[PDB]
Amino acid sequence: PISPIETVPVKLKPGMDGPKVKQWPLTEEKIKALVEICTEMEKEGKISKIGPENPYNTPVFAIKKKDSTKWRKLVDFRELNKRTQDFWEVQLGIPHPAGLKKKKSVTVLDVGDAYFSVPLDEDFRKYTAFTIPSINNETPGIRYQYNVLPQGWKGSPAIFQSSMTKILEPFKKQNPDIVIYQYMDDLYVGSDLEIGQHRTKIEELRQHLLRWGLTTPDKKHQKEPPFLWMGYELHPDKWTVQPIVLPEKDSWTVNDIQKLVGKLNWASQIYPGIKVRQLSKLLRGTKALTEVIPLTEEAELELAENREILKEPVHGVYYDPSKDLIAEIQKQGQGQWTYQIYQEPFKNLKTGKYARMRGAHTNDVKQLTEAVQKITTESIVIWGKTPKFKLPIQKETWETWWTEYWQATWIPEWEFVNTPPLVKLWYQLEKEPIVGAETFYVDGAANRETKLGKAGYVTNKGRQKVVPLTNTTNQKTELQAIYLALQDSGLEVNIVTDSQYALGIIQAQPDKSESELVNQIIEQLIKKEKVYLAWVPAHKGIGGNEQVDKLVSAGIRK
Amino acid sequence: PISPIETVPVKLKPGMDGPKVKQWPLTEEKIKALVEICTEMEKEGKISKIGPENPYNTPVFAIKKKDSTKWRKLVDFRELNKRTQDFWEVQLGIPHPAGLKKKKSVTVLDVGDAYFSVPLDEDFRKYTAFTIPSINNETPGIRYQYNVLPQGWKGSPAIFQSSMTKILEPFKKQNPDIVIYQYMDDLYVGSDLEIGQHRTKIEELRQHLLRWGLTTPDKKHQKEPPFLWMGYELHPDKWTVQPIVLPEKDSWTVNDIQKLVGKLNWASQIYPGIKVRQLSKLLRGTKALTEVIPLTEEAELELAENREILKEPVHGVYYDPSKDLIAEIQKQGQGQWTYQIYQEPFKNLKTGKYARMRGAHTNDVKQLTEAVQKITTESIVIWGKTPKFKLPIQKETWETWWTEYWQATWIPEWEFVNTPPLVKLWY
Ligand SMILES: CC(C)=CCN1Cc2c(Cl)ccc3[nH]c(=S)n(c23)C[C@@H]1C
């Protein structure tokens, strides 16, 4: 049949016109099938042959495939698709399993050839014209236009999503507690009804649609209890991804690695622990996807590791709006963090992980926060709530972090809790010049072209020092000049730099960088009692500058 | 019901299509508040349900107005606004009253409700399309369209210009001094009245308004004592760049002299006239930070000398109405916040500090959020235009809680920084 649904008005793009894409006279052979398929199709009421007053025309294609015993039609309105308007973006967003709720029974019902059972706007029909001709020399140009939603035109899915949505309305008005999601051309009906008592309604539904011509070929709602949707694998009380294998072998190519990392991330949603650091870092090259990516030990070490976790299957439960969402976070290692959101004591709902790829050298506390965020966002998008956090960091450490930041932040209710990596400010600079300690006027620079530098300094006690440097730019030497002053310093020390950069970094109260100099600068500070970095505009003619600067003439002069 | 007005024909500025701004997922709390509000709107015919033949969108958020009362929807009309109203301001351009900022007080009446009467051109309704979200994309979203004059749109007060005037005429003729400016849907009304007088003169205007057109305002202050706001009873007769004092260190110290010399160095960018050379000398040793060095007789001359050149300002006062103003905030301390409004760096038209020390409301996001608005009003009152913001907060973080502490009708344009403030000090 067809559906008696209110047609939806469509119009070609402003200043556009129906396509005149003529076609390549296909083999007389399948030229027959185009007919016999079309006749029935026309007879079903889907097409109505009209060849005179409708100059538009699209190319008919045809062929068979995917374990079939018959011919299939092909037609792609791509040109028409180009001249058509933009419809509502059907589903610019799929749901996330961790948000669904548990139902007793569910069932999927294939929505036949859904697009056909629906009628296209009485006018656009013209713009859907095709030509099937008869032999190499004689073809009166038999032309047909559509009446139902074309099999591969731009409006179909949106229109269709809508139409069905309408069709389900009264029924679900009469039957309110049976959840329905749709999808593509698949209808997922679910609820809290006993298996039989459930198949009850599914029938009431199944015929309702039969009323609107939507032949649902499902016999008694024939559907596989383990649904295969968007990678996930669902059930009425649980959900999780399942076909994930890390291909083991030598001849590890770029693509295989990229693939490998995607694969893991995905697993990570539910799989508590997956790391991806080293393997992720490696792909950091440009498109040479075809070449070989020599995975070192550090990478191979993690792979085989996730491989261990990914081996033993984990499952997630569903949301119960009756319970408080909870999010607990831990710094698994280095820049890698992980988190989990649970409702009750031990059934995982959702798992994830934040990674410090962000800037360059970042504080950890900062990091915690940046993570508390990604979580916060994710929740909104799913449970519509904000989970109370289980954060590994004392309240006094954090309360002194945000109060000092130049940026703003917001701390949703979180309770402090004890666990390993503990979040705290490693070192911490002073606020005013320390009296006593040896004011150290640090400095140094390098010549970019010649890449030679010199860090060094001049305490306030006649004490100077310097070091020749090969392969160092003004920014490295600068911190390195801070490095010196920190070796040669004592417990309480006052440094003074020309650098804006080093002034900056040292202040970010960072840690564990991929910059030894820094890692070391940090380490000293950590091992120290009272630093107090300071800043005087370089070259401004401060004697403190003038001098440590004059030491540089030892490299050359200008 | 059945008896309406004519339709001022609006149209999208040529070479422009309608908006497709994506809908920010909202908490459920608000989703519900939106289906409520929205539905009466469907029942009173103000907004109508739509189909997929229409593919546009312009964001909505629920917000709780006037000191925690019930929800009010808000459409983030920025993009559309921009698209239609820009060239529409060249046409139905409402004008900006200079004298305003000079008035002792400016009170602000939300005339939003009104616009809900003049209908909207059948063809333009296409763009007012807002989409209210459904948690976790479980539902296709309740898509609406707008038949009347949406509130956020800026085309609306230009349209409702005609009607709104005459409503005011008899008031203005009895109250000529009272200046009345209209921005977006807000009635900025000011006078040089003794507070009480102004208070009354306003409610006089409150009442008048109701008579003349059931244009309804909010009963801001009843006879009951309340710790609630004192009304946006602004007072632009108090504004200035007074606090940027160079320290008065009698115990000048090597550190000090540096810090000072430092300040004077970027400062020299907003006052090309000052010279610190003579001061960088008293500092030429390689001594301990903590030691005194005030000597140079020639120098105490320059400290003092530059010290006051601050007060007396620069040329930076060329309100180019073509260039758009940039607002900028700096987090300063336990309540202190600061901004600067400018068109070309150091050519800042005005600057100021906001204050509300973390006590009964310590959320930075809050304090910032507020300030962004208290920053705005001004700009409106003065230039009659919102400054583009430079918010010192994380995108994702702000994109989440601005819509909460927010209690204003419009929504300024903004951008977030991730560049430390050298500009951090006391100013
Ligand atoms: C994510 C998809 C296709 C959801 C459709 N879906 C079916 C479903 C499944 Cl498959 C498992 C648990 C479920 N919990 C809820 S609610 N649903 C549900 C109802 C919607 C109707």
Q: Write out the two tokens for A128.
A: 């859907």
Q: And the tokens for B401?
A: 């809680």
Q: Which of A373, A519, A319, A177 is nearest to B28 (CA)?
A: A319
The response to whether B186 counts as a known ligand-binding position is yes
CA A441, CA A413: separation in Å to the nearest integer? 45
Residue type, B173: K
| Rounded Cα–Cα distance for residues B73 and B79 (Å) | 18
Helix (H, G, I), strand (E, B) or coil at B37: helix
Q: Provide Rg for chain B, Cα atoms.
A: 25
Domain ranges of chain A: 1-90+116-156, 91-115+157-225, 226-319, 320-426, 427-557
The CA–CA distances, whole Å, from A190 to A109, A228, A241, B70, B212 equal 11, 15, 20, 35, 56
- Strand, helix or coil at A518? helix
Q: Which residues of B touch A100 (CB under 8 A)?
A: 136
Residue located via tokens 């000079």 = B102
CA distance A328 to A353: 11
| Measured CA angle at B158 (ends B154, B160), to 5 deg | 110
Residue A180: its H or E element: strand A178-181
Sheet holding A47-49, edge to edge: A47-49, A143-146, A129-131
Nearest Cα residue to A496 out of A551, A451, A552, A429:
A429
- Positive or negative, the CA dihedral A83, A88, A91, A93 is positive
Whether the Cβ atoms of residue B45 and residue B145 lie closer than 8 Å to each other: no
Q: Are strands A493-496 and A438-441 parallel, antiparallel or unpaired?
A: parallel
CATH number of this structure's domain A91-115+157-225, picked from the four choices 3.30.420.40, 1.10.10.10, 3.40.50.10540, 3.30.70.270: 3.30.70.270
CA distance A447 to A474: 8
CB B401 within 8 A of CB B365: yes
Helices in B47-137 by DSSP H: which ranges? 65-68, 78-89
Per-residue tokens: B165: 């005037």
Residues in chain A closer than 8 A to B288 (CB atoms): 433, 435, 438-439, 460, 494
Task: Tell me, letter by letter, the H, E, C secondary structure of A490-506.
Answer: CCEEEEEECCCHHHHHH
CA–CA separation, B214 and B199 (whole Å): 21
Rounded CA gap, A256 and A261, in Å?
A: 9
CA A80 from centre of chain: 32
Alpha helices in A277-346 (DSSP H): 277-282, 297-309
CB B39 within 8 A of CB B49: no
Q: How many CB atoms lie within 10 A of CB B177?
A: 12
Q: Note whether A99 contacts B: Cβ–Cβ < 8 A.
A: yes
Best residue among A111, A188, A227, A239 to mutate for probing ligand 1, ranked by most atoms within 8 Å of CB: A188
CATH 3.10.10.10 in chain B, residues?
Answer: 1-94+116-156
- Angle at which helix B395-405 crosses helix B364-383, to 10 degrees, equals 70
Q: Give Cα separations from B75 to A211, B64, B121, B124, B408 (angstroms).
A: 40, 14, 19, 16, 12
**CATH 3.30.70.270 domain span(s) along chain B:** 95-115+157-235, 236-319, 320-426
Report the C-alpha gap between B422 and B171 in whole angstroms: 51
User: Do residues A485 and A442 lie in contact, with contact meaning Cβ atoms separated by under 8 Å?
Assistant: yes
Say if strands A336-342 and A232-234 run parallel, antiparallel, or are unpaired.
unpaired
Please give the CATH number for the structural domain made up of A1-90+116-156.
3.10.10.10
Residue B342 belongs to what H/E stretch?
A: strand B337-344
Alpha-carbon dihedral angle through residues A226, A229, A234, A236, given to the nearest 10 degrees: -90
Top CATH class of B1-94+116-156 equals alpha beta
Q: Which CATH number fits domain A320-426: 3.30.70.270, 3.40.50.10190, 3.40.640.10, 3.40.1160.10?
A: 3.30.70.270
**B376 CB neighbour count, 10 Å cutoff:** 19
B374 secondary structure, DSSP code: H
Amino acid letter, A155: G
Closest CA to A381 of B400, B11, B124, B384: B400
Q: Compare CB distances from A406 to B29, B258, B420 and report the shortest one's residue.
A: B420
Beta strand A227-229 with A129-131 is unpaired
Rounded to the nearest 10°, the torsion over CA A145, A149, A153, A156 is 160
CB B194 within 8 A of CB B182: no
A269 in Cβ contact with A233 (< 8 Å): no
Q: Are A520 and A478 spatial neighbours (Cβ–Cβ below 8 Å)?
A: no
Contact A551/B at CB under 8 A: no
Chain A residues in contact with B255 by the CB 8 A cut-off are 432-433, 534
Check: CB of residue B364 under 8 Å from CB of residue A409.
Answer: yes
DSSP 8-state symbol, B116: S
Backbone angles phi, psi at A77, to 5 degrees: -75, 20
In degrees and rounded to multiples of 5, residue A198 shows phi and psi of -85, -45
- Whether residue A439 and residue B288 make contact (CB cut-off 8 A), yes or no, is yes
Please name the CATH architecture into which domain B236-319 falls. Answer: 2-Layer Sandwich (3.30)
Pocket of ligand 1 (CB under 6 A): A 95, 100-101, 103, 106, 179-181, 188, 190, 227, 229, 234, 236
Instruction: Determine the residue type at B94.
Output: I
Terminal Cα distance for chain B, rounded = 57
CA distance linking residue B149 with residue B115, whole number of Å = 5
How far is it, in rounded angstroms, from Cα A383 to Cα B29? Answer: 11
Asked if B404 and B343 count as a contact pair (C-beta separation under 8 A), the reply is no
Residues A238 and A316: beta-carbon distance below 8 Å: yes
Sheet with A227-229: strands ordered across: A227-229, A232-234, A239-241
Nearest Cα neighbor of B58 from B135, B149, B152 is: B152
Both tokens assigned to B229: 């706001």
Tokens of A345: 């004591």
Within 10 Å of residue A215's Cβ, how many Cβ atoms? 17
Q: What is the DSSP string of B259-273?
A: HHHHHHHHHTTSSTT
Q: What type of residue is A289?
A: L
Of the candidates A503, A494, A511, A498, the residue with the CA atom closest to the CA atom of residue A544? A498
Helix (H) or strand (E) holding A191: strand A186-191
Nearest-5° Cα angle at A39, A36 to A45:
145
For residue A264, give both structure tokens. 């893991």
d(CA B256, CA B63): 48
CA distances from A127 to A10, A207, A356, B83 (A): 11, 34, 53, 32
Ligand 1 centroid to residue A235 C-alpha, Å: 8
Cβ proximity of A235 and A102 under 8 Å: no
Instruction: Report yes or no: A299 and A278 within 8 Å, Cβ to Cβ.
Output: yes
Q: Which run of H or E residues covers position B302? A: helix B297-309
Superfamily of domain A427-557: Ribonuclease H-like superfamily/Ribonuclease H (3.30.420.10)
B185 marked ligand binding residue: yes
Q: How far is CA B31 from CA A62, A348, A381, A551, B46, in A?
A: 48, 27, 12, 67, 19
Residue A383 alpha carbon to ligand 1 centre in Å: 15
Q: Which fold has domain A226-319?
A: Alpha-Beta Plaits (3.30.70)
Identify the residue whose tokens are 């006391």: B426
Beta carbons of B265 and A540 less than 8 Å apart = yes
Q: Which two tokens stand for residue A349?
A: 């709902």
Domain B320-426 CATH class label: alpha beta
Cβ pair A408:B365 closer than 8 A: yes
Long-range pairs, B343-346, Cβ under 8 A, ≥24: B343/B318, B343/B319, B346/B269, B346/B270, B346/B316
Q: Cα separation of B157 and B177, whole Å? A: 23
Q: What is the 3-state secondary structure (H, E, C) of B276-291?
A: CHHHHCCCCCCCCCCC
Best CA proximity match to A386, nearest among A354, A410, A355, A353: A410
State this model's resolution in angstroms: 3.0
Q: Report the CATH number of the B95-115+157-235 domain.
A: 3.30.70.270
* SS3 of residue A100 by DSSP: coil
Which segments of A are annotated as binding site for Mg(2+)?
Answer: 110, 185-186, 443, 478, 498, 549
